[PDB]
């Protein structure tokens, strides 16, 4: 009932890349689906870097719908160890079989050791608040919901890459994915999806806080993330160990239990669900900030070390309500 499933790829680069037709007739490309920021991104075939090429570049010259600015623009956006630049058009979308019109985007011109060069990278879908949006005026999403009025104004996202049955959903929630109920947080300002954070512990080391904190919801993140003071603390309390596929499980089995406090609701994070498979050891899946940017000093809840044990949806705030993000135990198979 107006709630459509976007099936979502696990790739070999950790990616989970889901599907987007782009113009007319449809270019399919295949982003990222990324709450960590806003702008509509998509790799065009004016980029002619290796890089570029190696992916389905969108080329908006065979595009009836494409509209590129009256006005030259130049876009440069920091994507981890990478950068992006290109331009600015509008374009019409299609995700799940709904349209999306006149919408904003940035044309990938150029992606210049670089994290691009591992990846498959072909696009991001932001689904931030506006606020965030460097390319356009309306975000994707709300553009979505408002010329597809039977929608209701919120996403949710089921991580499951053991049997490549991730899945991004909108205009609702799915019984099929989650365990229990569904915990609202409010999002304390629209920008990221970010709540407040009470405290962390690493079984009984007190990790956070002493500082109010925040914690932001991040799928284009894997690692979850603490500030570097904080970071180090981690580490010496949680370290990696040599691994197998045949004994990740006993390795980890009296590892720590992370504690994350949201008032009265304590989120339990377990070792095999925080700790990774690397290079025949276990190692953590988290990490800092080392770059300076807006989240350094927030605490990143990601894919690998969050989504796979909780499903998670977001709420758009209607009116003076605000946006709210649920955690609720995600369902096995
Ligand atoms: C898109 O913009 C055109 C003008 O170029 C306008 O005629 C049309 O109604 C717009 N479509 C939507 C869905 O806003």
Same mark, same amino acid.
């Given at each position: 009932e107006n709630v459509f499933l976007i099936p979502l790829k696990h790739l070999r680069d950790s990616q989970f890349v889901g599907t987007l037709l782009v113009g007319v007739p449809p270019q399919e490309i295949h982003p990222?689906? *990324?709450? /960590?920021?806003? #702008?509509?991104?998509?790799?065009?075939?004016?980029? =002619? %870097? =290796?890089?570029?090429?190696?992916?389905?570049?969108? !080329?908006?010259?065979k595009s009836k719908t494409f509209r590129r600015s009256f006005i030259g623009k130049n876009l440069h956006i920091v994507f981890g160890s990478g950068s992006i630049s290109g331009s600015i058009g509008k374009e019409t979308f299609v995700l799940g079989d709904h349209t999306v019109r006149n919408q904003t985007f940035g044309l990938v011109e150029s992606e210049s050791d670089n994290i691009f060069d591992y990846i498959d990278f072909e696009g991001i879908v932001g689904l931030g608040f506006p606020e965030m949006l460097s390319a356009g005026?309306?975000?994707?999403? *709300? #553009?979505?919901?408002?010329? !597809?009025? #039977?929608?209701?104004?919120?996403?949710?996202?089921?991580?499951?890459?053991?049997? !490549?049955?991730?899945?991004?959903?909108?205009? /609702?929630?799915?019984?099929?994915?989650? =365990?229990?109920?569904?915990?609202?947080?409010?999002?304390?300002? %629209?920008?990221?999806?970010?709540? %407040?954070?009470?405290?962390?512990?690493?079984? =009984?080391?007190?990790?956070?806080?002493?500082?109010?904190?925040?914690?932001?919801?991040?799928?284009?993140?894997?690692y979850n993330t603490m500030p570097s003071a904080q970071m180090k603390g981690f580490f010496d309390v949680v370290p990696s160990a040599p691994c197998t596929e045949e004994n990740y499980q006993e390795v980890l089995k009296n590892y720590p239990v992370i504690k994350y406090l949201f008032g009265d609701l304590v989120i339990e994070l377990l070792p095999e669900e925080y700790m990774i498979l690397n290079e025949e050891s276990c190692i953590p899946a988290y990490m800092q900030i080392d770059v300076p940017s807006?989240? !350094?000093?927030?605490?990143?809840?990601?894919?690998?070390?969050?989504?796979?044990?909780?499903?998670?949806?977001?709420?758009?705030?209607?009116?003076?309500?605000?946006?709210?993000?649920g955690v609720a135990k995600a369902r096995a198979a």
């Open positions: 990222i689906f *990324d709450t /960590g920021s806003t #702008n509509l991104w998509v790799v065009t075939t004016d980029c =002619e %870097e =290796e890089s570029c090429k190696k992916v389905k570049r969108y !080329n908006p010259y005026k309306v975000s994707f999403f *709300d #553009n979505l919901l408002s010329q !597809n009025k #039977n929608l209701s104004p919120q996403f949710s996202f089921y991580i499951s890459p053991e049997d !490549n049955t991730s899945t991004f959903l909108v205009g /609702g929630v799915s019984k099929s994915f989650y =365990e229990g109920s569904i915990y609202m947080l409010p999002v304390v300002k %629209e920008y990221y999806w970010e709540v %407040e954070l009470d405290g962390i512990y690493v079984g =009984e080391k007190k990790i956070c806080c002493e500082e109010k904190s925040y914690a932001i919801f991040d799928t284009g993140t894997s807006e989240k !350094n000093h927030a605490y990143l809840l990601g894919s690998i070390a969050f989504m796979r044990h909780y499903y998670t949806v977001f709420v758009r705030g209607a009116g003076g309500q605000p946006s709210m993000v």
